[PDB]
């Protein structure tokens, strides 16, 4: 509640607000019979002890205490009554006038000495001439004092400190010391040692800090509070709340100057200002919507293709292929159709693992039965010429392929287990990449193992390439080996190109570009494989 | 260097060191002349007001200047006859008294007022009477009374200032004294009075550079002569802990005002005892012959390879073929290098060789034995129908080449992946305890070695099934009967050893690990290369 006190107390003191926020106005003032006479400073206390008023004030009250100790001598001195002789008058006029030069910050002083008032008053600093005009103890203080007269004038605020002089029934007299405070400032308007101790910060901190984490509204002096004295080297900094990426952020938006407001601004996704274009990369729908619809359509068509094959058996053309083998190939491809749909969402960890788990099993089920079928053809040919036909339809090929499936399962299990152990230390999965324009995007990193899988598929397919080379004169009824040759070479070339491209230009590619390339490669290899191995089964009879 | 000068200054003043070692001294014995006019003051010459020893002296000098300002005001009083009446004489000495009770600590004071001495002085604080005798605030060194003995005072200063006169120099001063007995005597660091910043016998000149963060002070750096009193700052003596390194707390020897040693409690770890906790005990009765014996096994295996190189006839071995038995007798060497490697410190290069050797050795030995056992079965199942497709080296070897390719590939992948996280964490050379707070250096488990443990188990399952198949085939030299043992042994012992090694990972000593490795290696491998070889030179 300390903050609002100043605002509500401004309307009991006309013309004064302009003086605090503009000290120099006094020059043009000819109104206000008497200026401010008493201002409420009790929120921190009656008066700040050990204040931040510099040692100056401490040493001033110390000189006053020494002086009063001096006057606390002749109250009891023997025969020290006299009759106010001229020498005694000189001593009296000197004893406090000396106090002036001992502190650069003491205004006029005086001594009452009621017996003949005999009071003396002095002029300003560095030029002072005495003038004579005809219960409680321990240095009681007082509120700031204003010379009423018929204005306020430049001097403005001075504190009227005083104490008492006891005698041998007190003396009904005191000593007056005045302290100039124009040269001192407020306690940075946020500390706890003066008028505005951790208060008078209208619409800052509590209003701008809780939400704005690390708002830092002060820096060196928050919420310039009253001024009026001067503008010293404390550097009173207003609207200093930066907040970094905080929801309030800089907030250099509106309600500037004394009427501070507009705490909430310049915070969208990253530590920037004035909207959300920075950092986040542009997202399009024309290259992120039709793609998935097309992929789903192709998937559904493949499903219906599997079914129709289930509906055709007696066509001897397929009989050579074998129902089980072709169904396995189609399912392998269907499974291979999930590196794009997975890329359509945010790159989590579960998805970033699902991607490899799908790609590897597909790339092993599809071109792990074509190669074996070519092998079976080659072996049967090389054996028939010498009294032998060992191989047979599904039942041998599938069992042999089970070995490749076992090896792939094993490697994937090892890789998954190893990856979900380092999560305690580092993730190294969901990284951020730049694109030469100070924009960050979230992607999945390279594991240094994918380099190995890329070359593993290449080496494996070399075996199929050699098979293709060997079988070139075998009489075939439906030219199936001729077709599968394309399905092998095409992959050997494309997959290599796509892998190298994806690896080199890895971080320099936005998410949408990655999706485009993935879809391109998938529909340039897998679709060709399905089409080549299937279409020539319902035609060319 | 001021330390050395202070030590020299110690021996130029009789019966004086004991005052700083012990405050009283005169309390038991004070028999000396006017001694202690000046000892060191301050290493940087003097302190006008710098080094800030308590604010009490700040306020003292401030009151001094303030009071002298009064007199400076009473310099050119107009028509000041100053006849020195009873009231005139009263005023000045009343002021002199007044200057007293404004501060806690202060001693006698006096005013000369040379017009006729007119010198007025009083006693210490809280006890003042009147005694008459018959620029820029210059300082002075510590003072002591000289009329007889030394007694209590103990280095009270004699600050004073003068006053000016006009119509020249009045030749008058306002003397004050300050008792410094009740004052903290510096901290022997962070240069102040009587002590510039190191100021003791080898605070760090012998120990700290060896071990940084010595922490000699904590709150009071290597408490110095002191002597004025014992303040509440807890003068810290020999407080330099320094944790590890030779510079330590060093609670060993030479513990006194001269404790220059501070040289101990440094053996391998941040402890004080002799090296023993940091490094577990090593034996030689166990860690020495274990390598000599394995060297002998290796040399015998090499000579046995040669011996087979010198026997090609004796058809008994023809059924196995030179090209294959040689491969086995070589794969064995590779398998024989998990012990010699473990004989040295666990670096990273060695901690990688440990897998590179083991995996290749295995894939060779039980990648050729299994294939031979498969060839026998195939030939048997084929001859019963007109067919003999298989053949010795040239057929088995290329089939084994596939296993070697796969193993090479996996090892390359694993090595590359493990020499990439070294930028962040090493996760290779770790340490563990054994329930008695003992640390030792070992190689940890990669979470991939679990997979390699089960891979060989699955592989040898194929071998055991082969063994189950070939049971009634007529064999000339019972070779399959032999190889069955070589397969089951490594099915069982290998699994047991792997589980034991993995579960008791960190709770096992280094020498204990060496013992277990040697036991396992010589309980399976030797049986393999002795069972497949010995019969070839007997049972003819």
């Amino acid at each position, epitope marked *: 509640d300390g903050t609002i006190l100043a605002q509500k107390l401004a309307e009991e003191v006309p013309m004064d607000v302009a003086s605090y926020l503009y000290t120099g106005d006094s020059h043009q003032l000819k109104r206000a019979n008497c200026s401010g006479r008493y201002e409420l400073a009790g929120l921190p206390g009656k008066w700040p002890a050990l204040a931040s008023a510099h040692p100056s004030l401490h040493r001033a009250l110390d000189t006053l205490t020494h002086a009063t100790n001096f006057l606390n001598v002749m109250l009891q001195s023997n025969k020290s009554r006299e009759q106010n002789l001229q020498d005694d008058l000189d001593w009296y006029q000197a004893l406090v006038w000396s106090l002036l030069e001992g502190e650069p910050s003491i205004s006029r002083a005086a001594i009452t000495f009621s017996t003949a008032p005999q009071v003396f008053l002095q002029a300003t600093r560095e*030029e002072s001439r005495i003038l004579l005009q005809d219960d409680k103890s321990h240095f009681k203080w007082s509120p700031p004092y204003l010379e009423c007269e018929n204005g306020s004038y430049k001097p403005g605020w001075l504190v009227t400190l005083s104490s008492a002089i006891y005698g041998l029934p007190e003396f009904r007299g005191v000593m007056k010391v005045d302290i100039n405070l124009q040269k001192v400032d407020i306690d940075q308007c946020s500390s706890d040692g003066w008028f505005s101790g951790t208060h008078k910060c209208h619409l800052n901190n509590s209003e701008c800090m809780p939400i704005k984490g690390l708002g830092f509204v002060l820096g060196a002096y928050e919420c310039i509070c009253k001024a009026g004295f001067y503008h010293p080297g404390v550097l009173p900094v207003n609207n200093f709340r930066r907040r970094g990426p905080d929801q309030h952020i800089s907030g250099s938006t509106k309600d500037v100057s004394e009427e501070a407001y507009v705490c909430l601004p310049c915070r969208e996704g990253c530590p920037f200002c004035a909207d959300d274009s920075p950092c986040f990369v542009q997202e399009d729908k024309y290259l992120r919507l039709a793609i998935i619809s097309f992929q789903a359509l192709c998937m559904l068509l493949d499903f219906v293709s599997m079914l129709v094959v289930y509906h055709f058996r007696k066509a001897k053309s397929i009989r050579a292929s074998g129902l089980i083998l072709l169904e396995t190939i189609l399912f392998g491809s269907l499974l291979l159709y999930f590196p794009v749909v997975i890329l359509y969402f945010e790159p989590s960890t579960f998805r970033c693992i699902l991607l490899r788990w799908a790609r590897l099993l597909g790339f092993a089920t599809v071109y792990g039965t074509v190669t074996l079928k070519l092998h079976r053809v080659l072996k049967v040919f090389l054996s028939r010429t010498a009294q032998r036909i060992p191989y047979m339809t599904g039942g041998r090929v599938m069992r042999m392929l089970a070995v490749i499936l076992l090896v792939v399962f094993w490697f994937l299990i090892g890789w998954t287990s190893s990856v979900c152990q380092n999560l305690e230390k580092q993730i190294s999965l969901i990284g951020q990449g730049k694109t030469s324009d100070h924009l960050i995007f979230n992607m999945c990193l390279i594991d240094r193992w994918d380099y190995m899988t890329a070359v593993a598929e290449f080496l494996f397919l070399l075996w199929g390439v050699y098979l293709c080379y060997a079988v070139r004169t075998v009489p075939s009824a439906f030219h199936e080996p001729r077709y599968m040759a394309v399905a092998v070479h095409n992959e050997l070339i494309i997959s290599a190109i796509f892998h190298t491209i994806r690896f080199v230009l890895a971080s320099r590619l936005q998410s949408d570009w990655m999706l485009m390339l993935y879809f391109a490669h998938t529909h340039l290899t897998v679709t060709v494989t399905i089409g080549l191995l299937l279409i020539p089964k319902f035609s060319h009879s | 260097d001021g330390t050395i000068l202070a030590q020299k200054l110690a021996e130029e003043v009789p019966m004086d060191v004991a005052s700083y070692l012990y405050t009283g001294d005169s309390h038991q014995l004070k028999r000396a002349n006017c001694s202690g006019r000046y000892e060191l003051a301050g290493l940087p010459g003097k302190w006008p007001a710098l080094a800030s020893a308590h604010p009490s002296l700040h306020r003292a000098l401030d009151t001094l200047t303030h009071a002298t300002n009064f007199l400076n005001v009473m310099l050119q009083s*107009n028509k000041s006859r100053e006849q020195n009446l009873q009231d005139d004489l009263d005023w000045y000495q009343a002021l002199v008294w007044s200057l007293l009770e404004g501060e806690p600590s202060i001693s006698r004071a006096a005013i000369t007022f040379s017009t006729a001495p007119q010198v007025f002085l009083q006693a210490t604080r809280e006890e003042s009477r009147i005694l008459l005798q018959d620029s820029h605030f210059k300082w002075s060194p510590p003072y002591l009374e000289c009329e007889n003995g030394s007694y209590k005072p103990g280095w009270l200063v004699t600050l004073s200032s003068a006053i000016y006169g006009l119509q020249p120099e009045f030749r008058g001063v306002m003397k004050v004294d300050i008792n410094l007995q009740k004052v903290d005597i510096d901290q022997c660091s962070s240069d102040g009075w009587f002590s510039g910043t190191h100021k003791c016998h080898l605070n760090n000149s012998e120990c700290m550079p060896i071990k940084g963060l010595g922490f000699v002070l904590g709150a009071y750096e290597c408490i110095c002569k002191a002597g004025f009193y014992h303040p509440g700052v807890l003068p810290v003596n020999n407080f330099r802990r320094r944790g590890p390194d030779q510079h330590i707390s060093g609670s060993t020897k030479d513990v006194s005002e001269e404790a220059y040693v501070c040289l101990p409690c440094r053996e391998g770890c941040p402890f004080c005892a002799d090296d023993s906790p940091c490094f577990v005990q090593e034996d030689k009765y166990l860690r020495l012959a274990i390598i000599s014996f394995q060297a002998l096994c290796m040399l015998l295996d090499f000579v046995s390879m040669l011996v087979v190189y010198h026997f090609r006839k004796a058809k008994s071995i023809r059924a196995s073929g030179l090209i294959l038995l040689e491969t086995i007798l070589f794969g064995s060497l590779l398998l024989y290098f998990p012990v010699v490697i473990l004989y040295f410190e666990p670096s990273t290069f060695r901690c990688i060789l440990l897998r590179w050797a083991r995996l290749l050795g295995f894939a060779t030995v039980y990648g050729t034995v299994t294939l031979k056992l498969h060839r026998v079965l195939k030939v048997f199942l084929s001859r019963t129908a007109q067919r003999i497709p298989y053949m010795t080296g040239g057929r088995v070897m290329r089939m084994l080449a596939v296993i070697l390719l796969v193993v090479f590939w996996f090892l390359i992948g694993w090595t590359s992946s493990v020499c990439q996280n070294l930028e962040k964490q090493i996760s290779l050379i770790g340490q563990g305890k054994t329930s008695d707070h003992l640390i030792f250096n070992m190689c940890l488990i990669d979470r991939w070695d679990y997979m390699t443990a089960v891979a060989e188990f699955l592989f040898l399952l194929w071998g055991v099934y082969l063994c189950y198949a070939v049971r009634t085939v007529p064999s000339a030299f019972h070779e399959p009967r032999y190889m069955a043992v070589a397969v089951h042994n490594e099915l069982i012992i290998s699994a047991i050893f792997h589980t034991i090694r993995f579960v008791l990972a960190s709770r096992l000593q280094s020498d204990w690990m060496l013992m277990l490795y040697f036991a396992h290696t010589h309980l399976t491998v030797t049986v393999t290369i002795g069972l497949l070889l010995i019969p070839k030179f007997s049972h003819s």
Partner: nanobody
Amino acid sequence: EVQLQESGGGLVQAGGSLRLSCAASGSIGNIYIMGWYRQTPGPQRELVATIRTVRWTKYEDYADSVKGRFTISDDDAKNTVYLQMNSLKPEDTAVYYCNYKDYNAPSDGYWGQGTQVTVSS
């Protein structure tokens, strides 16, 4: 270091008067001392006057010989420091020099202007 402004021109006889105020424009009032160095070093009828004692309870600095001579005073917050030429004498002819004496003034002070006066019998 104050530019003292002397204004004392005018032809006066014996027994006349004149207010030659060395105003301290660059400073404030009764803080310094005077003593009015003059070109003629041989005044047989006593010397120029001076007043004030810097800051301590302004005192009449006549040397017991100038009391019945040029008289000087101030008005507290009055920088104008005039010296009325009481009982003027023929020797008055000279160039007067108000000066500084407060501090950093070992060999007295210095002047910043010269007034050429002429007095006859």
